[PDB]
Amino acid sequence: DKRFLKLLRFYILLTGIPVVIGITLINVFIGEAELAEIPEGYVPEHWEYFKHPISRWIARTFF
Amino acid sequence: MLKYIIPTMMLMPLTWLSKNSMIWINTTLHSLLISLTSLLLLNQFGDNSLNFSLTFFSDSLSTPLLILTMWLLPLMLMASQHHLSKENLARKKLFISMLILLQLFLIMTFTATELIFFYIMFEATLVPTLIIITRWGNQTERLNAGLYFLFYTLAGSLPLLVALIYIQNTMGSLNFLILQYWVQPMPNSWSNTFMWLACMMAFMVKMPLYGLHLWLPKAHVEAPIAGSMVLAAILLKLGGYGMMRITLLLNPITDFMAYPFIMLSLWGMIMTSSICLRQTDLKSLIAYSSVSHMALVIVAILIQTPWSYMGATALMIAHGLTSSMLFCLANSNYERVHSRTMILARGLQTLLPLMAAWWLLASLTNLALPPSINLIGELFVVMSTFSWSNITIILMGLNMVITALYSLYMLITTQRGKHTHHINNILPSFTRENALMSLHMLPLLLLSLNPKIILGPLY
Amino acid sequence: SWDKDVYPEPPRRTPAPSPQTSLPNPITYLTKAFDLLVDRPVTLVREFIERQHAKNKYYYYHREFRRVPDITECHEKDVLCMFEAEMQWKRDYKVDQEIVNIIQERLKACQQREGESHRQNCAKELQQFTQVVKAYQDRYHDLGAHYSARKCLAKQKQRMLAERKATKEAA
Amino acid sequence: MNLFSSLTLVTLILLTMPIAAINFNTHKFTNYPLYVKTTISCAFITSMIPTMMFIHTGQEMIISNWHWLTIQTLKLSLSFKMDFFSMMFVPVALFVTWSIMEFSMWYMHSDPNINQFFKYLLLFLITMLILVTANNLFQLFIGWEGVGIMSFLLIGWWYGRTDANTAALQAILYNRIGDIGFILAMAWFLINLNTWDLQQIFMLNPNDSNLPLMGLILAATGKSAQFGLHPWLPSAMEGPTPVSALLHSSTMVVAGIFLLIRFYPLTENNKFGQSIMLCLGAMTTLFTAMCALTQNDIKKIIAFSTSSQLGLMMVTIGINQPHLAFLHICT
Amino acid sequence: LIRWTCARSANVYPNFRPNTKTSLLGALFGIGPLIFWYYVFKTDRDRKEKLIQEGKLDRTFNISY
Amino acid sequence: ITKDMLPGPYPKTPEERAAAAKKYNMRVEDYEPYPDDGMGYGDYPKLPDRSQQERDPWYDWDHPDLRLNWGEPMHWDLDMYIRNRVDTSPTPV
Amino acid sequence: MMTGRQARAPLQFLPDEARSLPPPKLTDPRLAYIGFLGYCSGLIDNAIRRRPVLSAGLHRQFLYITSFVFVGYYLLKRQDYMYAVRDHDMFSYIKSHPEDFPEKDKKTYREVFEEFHPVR
Amino acid sequence: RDHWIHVLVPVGFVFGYYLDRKNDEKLAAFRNKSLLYKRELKPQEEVTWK
Amino acid sequence: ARQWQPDVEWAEQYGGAVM
Amino acid sequence: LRWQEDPEPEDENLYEKNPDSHGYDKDPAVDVWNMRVVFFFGFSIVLVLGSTFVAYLPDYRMQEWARREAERLVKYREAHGLPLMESNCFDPSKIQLPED
Ligand SMILES: CCCCCCCCCCCCCCCCCC(=O)OC[C@H](COP(=O)([O-])OCC(O)COP(=O)([O-])OC[C@@H](COC(=O)CCCCCCCCCCCCCCCCC)OC(=O)CCCCCCCCCCCCCCCCC)OC(=O)CCCCCCCCCCCCCCCCC
Ligand SMILES: CCCCCCCCCCCCCCCCCC(=O)OC[C@H](COP(=O)([O-])OC[C@H](O)COP(=O)([O-])OC[C@H](COC(=O)CCCCCCCCCCCCCCCCC)OC(=O)CCCCCCCCCCCCCCCCC)OC(=O)CCCCCCCCCCCCCCCCC
Ligand SMILES: CCCCCCCCCCCCCCCCCC(=O)OC[C@H](COP(=O)([O-])OCC[N+](C)(C)C)OC(=O)CCCCCCCCCCCCCCCCC
Ligand SMILES: CCCCCCCCCCCCCCCCCC(=O)OC[C@H](COP(=O)([O-])OCC[N+](C)(C)C)OC(=O)CCCCCCCCCCCCCCCCC
Ligand SMILES: CCCCCCCCCCCCCCCCCC(=O)OC[C@H](COP(=O)([O-])OCC[N+](C)(C)C)OC(=O)CCCCCCCCCCCCCCCCC
Ligand SMILES: CCCCCCCCCCCCCCCCCC(=O)OC[C@H](COP(=O)(O)OCCN)OC(=O)CCCCCCCCCCCCCCCCC
């Protein structure tokens, strides 16, 4: 049971810690977007309609 | 949806070309890759459903059932290999192929654009299930269990088939995208009454209905573990998903014809719960619990309010994960005591403490401990049925006493008290078994954090 | 930030501290302790984060769903126009739902910040809430879980029949 | 504003940290009961600051810090409500739980599962301070079922004893009978007011609210062991004496009375509900104190005593005095 | 134990004879409560529908259903 | 397990009743099955219909939380008459 | 059904006006399904005669695949021909008889009165 | 390749992904023809979506 | 404890002239 | 002895010959690599990165957007004296009622 608990916490933290560090390095350095009015004649792509950079990356790549 | 059917079909040369010890590892690895891939269907919109082609679309209703189905294959492959270690390599590949084939039929049952393709896949899911139950089952009564499962369902569905062809001759098409827009109000006659019965009774059988549920406690205790997982978690939810598709066409005759089946389900969720009080057979107790929970899904679909549909889909997802974990806990006893009698093996907290904690978590989520989405689904169903009629809360609340009383008794009998003296093969919990419990329960505990992905087409 | 008008607030009128007792009250000293030890380091961390944010400016846009022909000018059993009508109505349905949510937030915050005198001082927010719930009940209530623009138009035609009968029976 | 809400949430997050400490261990702990006792000591010291800055000003607020769900008109937000009741009960609950843990370091020293016991007691404290700080009926139902299930897991502590498990099953049976009325109350408020938040319930001010008050009286009867649904509190002494001393005397059993004191803007406008609460409280405080006259097990006598005081709490709610009742809880 | 589980589960219908006693128990226990709850909920919903269709039921704030 | 130890239908002749008493491991005078009224029992014995709480606890049983031996014919409602459920032990009044 | 159509020209598998249609490609997915059936016929032919399932009879599997694709191509041509004949007869009959096929005046939803049946 | 069996299902998903993106070309009959998402085309951009 | 497969007693049901 | 038969085998303990077994396979290298496959592609792929993917969904069914639109449109009808919601959804000038 202790071996299962140690392996469970290890294989969760294996991408728990670096991806939380990546969320930190995106939210501090890249930066959350700011609301703006729509200009004249400018038509964005569909991923430029969302707030967080990770949602924008998902909407550009996967969707 | 052809990016999910092609890898599921590619899992057949992935399981027939693998080496003699690799046939679990390759299928588990690639099926987990498919399950992580399956989150791409969260591109849903508040007005439009995610619509792929003339053959497949996937709304916000079919999407959580798809993620659950493509997640349920690796859990079945983990759960169903300790009792198949001495089995021959060819039939082991056949068992893995039948599980992959059943996943292949399920993932294009839920994404069916046109409803006769929904019918063909909806009755195509019988065949690998039937082969699993009658071939890789464990006891004598599985062969009888291959008939009661089969000839009930077809006895509703071959009229249902006829009904769908009538719509193909009357509305002009069986597309769900068309029949959101060409649906006509169905008046009162005996013709439209048997139209309603032909549309609904096959799904009543596969919910199951109280009275037509006789196949279910025999098809769960006689299947193997992967069979019991896939009959509890998905194959009872084909009926709920199909009713949510098919009650679009059945207004307003459902507003006065659905009353006896509402009464059947609102009293069956009391009677099968009282049956869950008095089961010597643990896997029978979990099967009657599945009946006692799906009765509220029948009620929430027939009263057809938004709180009821969101509660019904949340309870379908949450009860799928809960009942799959409960049958795997029954397997984790039965692989060590070799009997499904619940009164045999008592006092397992003195022997398996972390497994007893998993028994505790599944026994608390079975009685809908908030803020788990068991309680979200149960709660919204009870709210909508108080909106339907103000006395029904009694039959809800009384049920929410007895839903505790078999969830805790199974917690008290199998875990608490004096241990058994003549049993000394209670082995420690394998990493397979605890990984199995974690992959059952921890997605259900993470969906408490963000339930808005499993709340139907009308969130 | 937000918009101050759609989420209205009365002007903050705090009273002055009137020290009468000779013991120094611990709130001013705990306030200065939280001010020196916690408030200013969190200020410096937030301004460091702000200086990191300002180097790469970009924007999203609030998507405009422009108006299309609704269900009343669509030919019967024509899906190419009533699809647009149905998507327009479902987006307007979500918008009316969030308007009712905004009115609920106004009413609850009025009841909290008007304290014990909440029964009198929140009559305007209660009147706005009662009117918008009567409008939402006459617009979208009792449709069904398979709701559509056909259902909403059928309800609206039934209610206009009842209003025309009410006009005719008293004239 | 920056102080009150901050140390308020710091109280609850400080409580939730040793659960993360006990779940994420590899080694055997160097004196984990001292760790959790020092945690709840500093949680009392922390939560005394919002109490003082409420006693001076009279500053009540609401921390709706995380909107969690939107069911088409109803906003389920992670919303805490700091009013008179939380500000006077959270120091009492934390202080009594701190005394019970420093008693449990003496009583449960023979247990090798002492760390599991302090984990469970902290989990009960977290769910109880979710119950008393909830802004709405769903989060109050979260705290309700949390303290009910911890009543199960701490009555049935010595799980090899059959009577302990039977008394725990009894306690959950009576609690779910209370949950019938509480879910009836949530159903009535959703259907007839479109809310679970207490602000909108108090603002709309229903007057034909006989049925939801019958539901809340059934909830209080299930939780605070009133007559008809009382005997689980007699049988609930089969758990450990720190469990009885904390839960079933000071912290758990005053939750249904807390639910009734919470709804004083509705129970102030009903005469029949007050008469029902008055007769039920007199019935409870007669029957339990009469049963306590001839007994010989001391834990049974003190449990009948606290159920008699719960009957007295029900009486003083029934006389339109919720604040004397809450003063009586914190006393 | 195997004998008791066999007598409780797998030897119930092969020990059955449909007579007047078991028929008047099975009909009184199976369809009796269903017909009773049918009358109860049908009477209550007819009363509720008659109140709603005239506006005699106070349905001022009811917008979540 | 083999079929001649498993339960059968309700017996008619006294030699069938005696062979079934030989099956269930209990004496012949004490062998009482449930009466043939068609409820679905069969030849299962009707044990004296009290709780396991009335069992003398100082005896060294094989299953002490059940207070029940090995091979002894269990009651039809055995999960009902355990100490976790309905107690039929005698009361003073 | 069409016994008055295929009676002036009997035993024609593909008529002259069957070539006025686009023929199926070699990459037709129905033809690829028939080729999959040919490979499965090769696999079952190996398996029932106790041969290696992947190794034995590469000429045998190759002619099973080629034979099913070669028959399936002309079956798909006849299939597409007969459905084109069905739609051609339908459209010529709709053109010839206007009084049996009126242009339906689709009145918009502002005039269509559908009775509202509420759910409660 | 020494691990040729671990590239059936990823290449299978590439194949299904390409068939779905290619099937989205054949259902492009209303590519920039809806009564909502209609607009003037930006320069050096001949389709609105692929 | 192992899987049940049919024996001679079960298989003599399928051996007569009729079923 | 009717239907001559193998003796029934033992319910084998994997921990006798292999006390480092996880329970997947009796050959230990294949067993521990199956453990690594389960934990890596089950937790370090699907739960953590998948929960990150579900965590930052781009506005699942417009629950953000419909709020923000409302925070404009109430502004569009708090200023200019319009009511916050009509009792009519569709325009009553373009509805043809059936005459009586
Ligand atoms: C955290 C690591 C822990 C260890 C790792 C392992 C953890 C386990 C495995 C996890 C595996 C991954 C799981 C999936 C994660 C997915 C991400 C996610 O969930 O995001 C959600 C959400 C999404 O955020 P986002 O969209 O990415 O960005 C937000 C803004 O857009 C943008 O905001 P921003 O840009 O302004 O901020 C960005 C942020 C970076 O972004 C983040 O950190 C956000 C992402 C973190 C997610 C972590 C999730 C894991 C679980 C954490 C919680 C449980 C831990 C265990 C239990 C602990 C006890 C409870 O920057 C900072 O952190 C810097 C500021 C630090 C302030 C504090 C210190 C200030 C003073 C310092 C003084 C000293 C220096 C002075 C001099 C300095 C000179 C320069 O993130 C969060 O909610 C953050 C988590 C913490 C929230 C507050 C927690 C306390 C709340 C209390 C009240 C409510 C509860 C009350 C309970 C009452 C009792 C019941
Ligand atoms: C997206 C980012 C999110 C970040 C935050 C994470 C969110 C939660 C994720 C899931 C966490 C559950 C972990 C513990 C339970 C499962 C394993 C277990 O049995 O542990 C016992 C064991 C501790 O026992 P032990 O003494 O060390 O050894 C075993 C004992 O011999 C035998 O043990 P025992 O018998 O003494 O212990 C039984 C005891 C029994 O205790 C209880 O039953 C009492 C507590 C639960 C009932 C009452 C409370 C009800 C809920 C109210 C409070 C929560 C909500 C409050 C919200 C604010 C106010 C409204 O259980 C516990 O103390 C478990 C504490 C956590 C319980 C959670 C609720 C389960 C109840 C059923 C569902 C309830 C509704 C849903 C709640 C969802 C919450 C998110 O835990 C561990 O050793 C830890 C194992 C590794 C855990 C990994 C967790 C993460 C998995 C997902 C990874 C990927 C996602 C990224 C997140 C990563 C975060 C690290
Ligand atoms: C699981 C077991 C129970 C399953 C129950 C299934 C539902 C019960 C009733 C099924 C009836 C058969 C399907 C009806 C389909 C109706 C389609 C339709 O449009 O009907 C309108 C049509 C109406 O006729 P019409 O549409 O041609 O009318 C001409 C048009 N007007 C009205 C303008 C004049 O209905 C029928 O023609 C007959 C319908 C009833 C059929 C009765 C025979 C079947 C008997 C019951 C079989 C039940 C299942 C059998 C298996 C049980 C186990 C062995
Ligand atoms: C101990 C280490 C801690 C972390 C150390 C490092 C980080 C230091 C601090 C900086 C953090 C980053 C910035 C602040 C965090 C993000 C702020 C923010 O706006 O985030 C977006 C939001 C805030 O809400 P929102 O309204 O902006 O978005 C919600 C999302 N929608 C609207 C789409 C539904 O989320 C959070 O802040 C998450 C906080 C979670 C805390 C509570 C967890 C409860 C767990 C149980 C769940 C079940 C409850 C169910 C019942 C609920 C009530 C009915
Ligand atoms: C889904 C249907 C099929 C089922 C099977 C699924 C198979 C695949 C499985 C993949 C993983 C599961 C998929 C769904 C994932 C859902 C989780 C998720 O994404 O959450 C996102 C949510 C996001 O929150 P949100 O919804 O508010 O989003 C905020 C909005 N953004 C991010 C855009 C700014 O994550 C959280 O809520 C995390 C909050 C911070 C971390 C936790 C802090 C508190 C921790 C506990 C403190 C103590 C509490 C009390 C404890 C007492 C004792 C118990
Ligand atoms: C404000 C309004 C107030 C109204 C008050 C009046 C009305 C309600 C009155 C109460 C009715 C229900 C409660 C009574 C039954 C309690 C059952 C129970 O748990 O009993 C305890 C019993 C063993 O405990 P005990 O006898 O103390 O042990 C001594 C050791 N030798 O435990 C056991 O034997 C375990 C048994 C397990 C199986 C239980 C079977 C019965 C389940 C009953 C469900 C009741 C649901 C009610 C729904 C109502 C809906 C409106």
**G85 is written with which tokens?**
């004949």
Beta bridge partners, D77, equal D67
| Stated length of chain J | 100
Strand A34-36 relative to strand C59-61, pairing: parallel
Cα(D311)–Cα(D35) distance, integer angstroms: 37
Which residues, other chains included, contact I10 with Cβ-Cβ below 8 Å and sequence gap of 6+? Answer: none
By the 8 A CB rule, do B53 and B3 touch?
no
By the 8 A CB rule, do D117 and D106 touch?
no
Which ligand has the nearest atom to the CA of D13? 1
- Would the CB atoms of J45 and B435 count as touching at under 8 Å? no
Which residues, other chains included, contact F80 with Cβ-Cβ below 8 Å and sequence gap of 6+? Answer: B278, F86
Distance from CA of J63 to the nearest CA of C (A): 8
Which ligand has the nearest atom to the CA of B349? 2
Nearest atom (ligand 6) to Cα of D217: 1
Cα(G24)–Cα(A61) distance, integer angstroms: 36
**B86 is written with which tokens?**
């001495």
Collapsing DSSP to helix, strand or coil, D234 comes out as helix
H/E segment holding residue E27: helix E20-30
Residue A13 main-chain phi, psi, to 5 deg: -70, -20
Residue with structure tokens 């590892």? B25
Give the CA-trace dihedral at D259, D265, D268, D270, to 10 degrees.
-90
Residue B175 exposure: Cα atoms within 13 Å on the Cβ side: 14
- Contacts with A4 from chain B: Cβ below 8 Å: 354, 429, 431, 434-435
- Would the CB atoms of I1 and J3 count as touching at under 8 Å? no
Burial environment of residue H10 by CB neighbours within 10 A (0 to 12, 13 to 18, 19 or more): middle
Do G and D touch, 3+ Cβ pairs within 8 Å? The answer is no
What total number of domains does chain B contain?
1
Burial environment of residue D290 by CB neighbours within 10 A (0 to 12, 13 to 18, 19 or more): exposed
Do C and J touch, 3+ Cβ pairs within 8 Å? The answer is yes
DSSP state of F5: T
Q: Transcribe J56-74 into DSSP letters.
A: T-S-GGGTTHHHHHHHHHH
- Contacts with E62 from chain C: Cβ below 8 Å: 137, 141
Chain B contact residues (CB < 8 Å to G): 185, 251-252, 255, 304-305, 387-388
Nearest atom (ligand 1) to Cα of A15: 11
| Neighbour-count burial for B216-247, b at 16+ CB within 10 Å, e otherwise | bbbbbbbbbbbbbbbbbbbbbbbbbbbbbbbb
Give CA separation, B384 vs B389, B392, D188, E48, H9, in Å.
Answer: 9, 10, 11, 15, 44
- Would the CB atoms of F40 and E12 count as touching at under 8 Å? yes
Cα(B415)–Cα(F84) distance, integer angstroms: 13
Residue with structure tokens 């397979």? B432
Resolution to one decimal, Å: 3.7
Which residues, other chains included, contact E60 with Cβ-Cβ below 8 Å and sequence gap of 6+? Answer: C130, C133, C134
By the 8 A CB rule, do B372 and B448 touch?
yes
Q: Helix, strand, coil % (nearest 5) of chain G?
A: 55, 0, 45
DSSP state of C15: P
Cα(C94)–Cα(C100) distance, integer angstroms: 10
Collapsing DSSP to helix, strand or coil, H50 comes out as coil
Do D and F touch, 3+ Cβ pairs within 8 Å? The answer is yes
Strand B57-58 relative to strand D74-82, pairing: unpaired
Q: Say if residue B208 is preceded by a cis peptide, omega within 30 of 0.
A: yes
Cα–ligand 3 centroid distance for B189 (angstroms): 12
By the 8 A CB rule, do E31 and D158 touch?
no
Which residues, other chains included, contact F75 with Cβ-Cβ below 8 Å and sequence gap of 6+? Answer: F47, F49, F81
Residue nearest to atom 19 of ligand 1 (CA): J55
Cα(B131)–Cα(B117) distance, integer angstroms: 22
Collapsing DSSP to helix, strand or coil, D66 comes out as strand
Which ligand has the nearest atom to the CA of D173? 6
Cα(G53)–Cα(G39) distance, integer angstroms: 11
- Would the CB atoms of G110 and J98 count as touching at under 8 Å? no
DSSP state of D280: H
Beta strands in chain A (DSSP E): 34-36
**G3 is written with which tokens?**
């016994």
Cα(D62)–Cα(D6) distance, integer angstroms: 12
Cα(B176)–Cα(B160) distance, integer angstroms: 16
Collapsing DSSP to helix, strand or coil, F16 comes out as helix
Give the CA-trace dihedral at H28, H32, H33, H35, to 10 degrees.
130
Give CA separation, J93 vs C163, J89, J97, in Å.
Answer: 14, 12, 10
Residue nearest to atom 32 of ligand 3 (CA): B191
Secondary structure, 3-state, G4-31: CCCCCCCCCCCCHHHCCCCCCCCCCHHH
C142: left (phi over 0), alpha (psi -120 to 50) or beta: left
The answer to whether the CB of J57 is under 6 A from ligand 5 is: no
By the 8 A CB rule, do D24 and D32 touch?
no
Nearest atom (ligand 4) to Cα of D70: 34
Range of the domain at B449: 1-459
Secondary structure, 3-state, C21-74: CCCCCHHHHHHHHHHHHHHHHHHHHHHHHHHHHCCCCCEEECCCCCCCCCHHHC
Amino acid present at B4? Y
Which residues, other chains included, contact B211 with Cβ-Cβ below 8 Å and sequence gap of 6+? Answer: B264, B268
Cα(D71)–Cα(D90) distance, integer angstroms: 31
Burial environment of residue B156 by CB neighbours within 10 A (0 to 12, 13 to 18, 19 or more): buried
Which of J15, J34, J46 is closest, CB to CB, to B24? J34
Helical pair B393-413 and B282-303, crossing angle rounded to 10 deg:
160
- Would the CB atoms of I4 and B138 count as touching at under 8 Å? yes
Range of the domain at H16: 1-50
Method: cryo-EM
Cα(D155)–Cα(D244) distance, integer angstroms: 8
Residue with structure tokens 């001949």? H46
Breakpoints of chain G, after residues (C–N > 2.5 Å): none
Cα(F66)–Cα(F59) distance, integer angstroms: 12
Nearest residue in D to B402, CA atom:
D173
Kindly report the CA angle at B306 between B300 and B310, in degrees rounded to 5?
Answer: 65
- Contacts with J58 from chain A: Cβ below 8 Å: 47, 50, 55-56, 58-59, 63
Cα–ligand 5 centroid distance for J52 (angstroms): 9
Q: Which subunits sit against D, judged by 3+ Cβ pairs under 8 A?
A: A, B, C, E, F
Cα–ligand 4 centroid distance for D66 (angstroms): 6
Give CA separation, F19 vs C13, F16, F46, in Å.
Answer: 96, 5, 16
What total number of domains does chain H contain?
1
Cα(B384)–Cα(C133) distance, integer angstroms: 19
Single out the residue of D16, D77, D81, D5 nearest to residue D47, CA to CA. Answer: D5
Which residues, other chains included, contact B152 with Cβ-Cβ below 8 Å and sequence gap of 6+? Answer: B205, B212, B214, B215
Chain D contact residues (CB < 8 Å to B): 69-72, 138, 141-142, 145, 149, 152-153, 156, 159-160, 162, 165, 168-169, 172-173, 176-177, 179-181, 183-184, 186-188, 190-191
B53: left (phi over 0), alpha (psi -120 to 50) or beta: beta
Residue nearest to atom 37 of ligand 4 (CA): D66
Nearest residue in G to E62, CA atom:
G120
Single out the residue of B435, B448, B457 nearest to residue B79, CA to CA. Answer: B435
Give CA separation, H33 vs C74, C92, H27, H38, in Å.
Answer: 17, 22, 12, 6
- Contacts with A59 from chain J: Cβ below 8 Å: 58
Which residues, other chains included, contact I6 with Cβ-Cβ below 8 Å and sequence gap of 6+? Answer: none
The answer to whether the CB of B443 is under 6 A from ligand 5 is: yes
Cα(B141)–Cα(B144) distance, integer angstroms: 6
Amino acid present at F69? N
- Would the CB atoms of E6 and F37 count as touching at under 8 Å? no
Q: Say if residue E18 is preceded by a cis peptide, omega within 30 of 0.
A: no
H/E segment holding residue D302: helix D298-317
Kindly report the CA angle at B356 between B350 and B362, in degrees rounded to 5?
Answer: 160
- Would the CB atoms of F83 and D169 count as touching at under 8 Å? no
Helical pair B306-337 and B353-366, crossing angle rounded to 10 deg:
150
Number of H helices, E strands in chain I: 1, 0
Secondary structure, 3-state, chain B: CHHHHHHHHHHHHHHHCCCCCCCCHHHHHHHHHHHHHHHHHHCCCCCCCEECCCCEEECCCHHHHHHHHHHHHHHHHHHCCCCCCCCCHHHHHHHHHHHHHHHHHHHHHHCECEHHHHHHHHHHCHHHHHHHHHHCCCCCCHHHHHHHHHHHHHHHHHHHHHHHHHHHHHCCCCECCCCCCCCCCCCCCHHHHHHHHHHHHHHHHCCCCCCCCCCHHHHHCCCCHHHHHHHHHCCCHHHHHHHHHHCCCCCCCHHHHCHHHHHHHHHHHHHHHHHHHCCCEHHHHHHHHHHHHHHHHHHHHHHCCHHHHHHHHHHHHHHHHHHHHHHHHHHHHHHHHCCCECCCCCCCCCCCHHHHHHHHHHHHHHCCCCCCHHHHHHHHHHHHHHHHCCCCHHHHHHHHHHHHHHHHHHHHHCCCCCCCCCCCCCCCCCHHHHHHHHHHHHHHHHCCCCHHHCCCCCC
By the 8 A CB rule, do B286 and B323 touch?
yes
**J85 and chain G in contact, CB less than 8 A:** no
The answer to whether the CB of B412 is under 6 A from ligand 6 is: no
Which ligand has the nearest atom to the CA of A16? 1
